[PDB]
């Protein structure tokens, strides 16, 4: 497998380190998303260890709501990940248009996200660290796919701690902003911010300027719009506790504490995993090359890496 094994069809995203393209594999007629990074750029921007981390996490993980990796391969100038294509686009795309999701619909995505993160933490010893609307896509049937594993921490067993200042500023957990060592409960802060955006239509702490935004995160309690039901409020309150020791999910039971919360009383977690629950929204695509759920700005448009290469 090389660049010649594929046809390049549409640009889906492009973000400094490289690009994402909808491709078709010549041998099979199957469509994939190809993340194509320039080696030069990755090396120059210091993105090498993040690339290997994403490569290991993707190779090691198999879960219905995590993007599956088919191939990794390199050229002289490129590193390429060929991944399952999520034809439904980013949650960021949908919520930008719809403003808010109903509690039921936010619940469905929350449960799938919880199922994936419980898997990462408990089976794989990985903390994801960058949960956000942009890294949450919908597949052709309407199920969540988590994308973009470059910021993961690996080898994190139970409550063990980490130190890297990383993530996305609007989603950073207070213990991270405190410059404290922190554990996998940061993932449940991220879930809380995502759940908050879905049900409330805005970030719970907001300033365009990252540093003013950091002051709100550390100081202010979240506001609760009067339309939020009591189980929703309790869940958001719990996941956005600023002390991770008091956070929902912040103890030894990790995701099992969130799964038991009354906001999720309707949900049968084994059926979430088995994909037996009807998605609230099915992407209405005509074709497979139909990129209606991707932004028009896009779709209209040197070392050897030892043992990078992979096939599933």
């Amino acid at each position: 497998v090389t660049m010649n094994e594929f046809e390049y069809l549409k640009l889906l995203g492009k973000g400094t380190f490289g690009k994402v393209i909808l491709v078709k594999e010549k041998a099979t007629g199957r469509y994939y998303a190809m993340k194509i990074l320039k080696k030069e750029v990755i090396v120059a921007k210091d993105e090498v260890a993040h690339t290997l981390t994403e490569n290991r996490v993707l190779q090691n993980s198999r879960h219905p709501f995590l993007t599956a990796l088919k191939y990794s391969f390199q050229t002289h100038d490129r590193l390429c990940f060929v991944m399952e294509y999520a034809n439904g686009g980013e949650l960021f795309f949908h919520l930008s248009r719809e403003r808010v999701f109903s509690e039921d619909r936010a619940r469905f995505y929350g449960a799938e996200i919880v199922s994936a993160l419980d898997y990462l933490h408990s089976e794989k010893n990985v903390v994801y660290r960058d949960l956000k609307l942009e890294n949450l896509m919908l597949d052709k049937d309407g199920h969540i796919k988590i994308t973009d594993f470059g910021l993961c921490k690996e080898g994190i067993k139970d409550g063990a701690t980490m130190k890297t200042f990383c993530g996305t500023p609007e989603y950073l957990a207070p213990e991270v902003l405190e410059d404290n060592d922190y554990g996998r409960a940061v993932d449940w802060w991220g879930l809380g911010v995502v759940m908050y955006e879905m049900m409330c239509g805005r970030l719970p702490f907001y300033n365009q300027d990252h540093e003013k935004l950091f002051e709100l995160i550390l100081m202010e309690e979240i506001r609760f719009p009067r339309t939020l039901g009591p189980e929703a409020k309790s869940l958001l309150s719990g996941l956005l506790k600023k002390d991770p020791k008091q956070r929902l999910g912040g103890g030894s039971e990790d995701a099992k504490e969130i799964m038991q919360h009354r906001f999720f009383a309707g949900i049968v977690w084994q059926h979430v995993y088995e994909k037996k629950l009807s998605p609230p929204f099915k992407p209405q695509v005509t074709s497979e090359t139909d990129t209606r759920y991707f932004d028009e700005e896009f779709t209209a448009q040197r070392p050897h890496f030892p043992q990078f290469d992979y096939s599933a």
Binding site: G15, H50, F92, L95, S96, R97, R99, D130, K132, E134, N135, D148, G150, L151, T164, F165, C166, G167, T168, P169, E170, Y171, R202, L203, Y206
Partner: peptide
Amino acid sequence: GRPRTTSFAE
């Protein structure tokens, strides 16, 4: 709708 955010690592 908020602007797209950017991931980072220090």
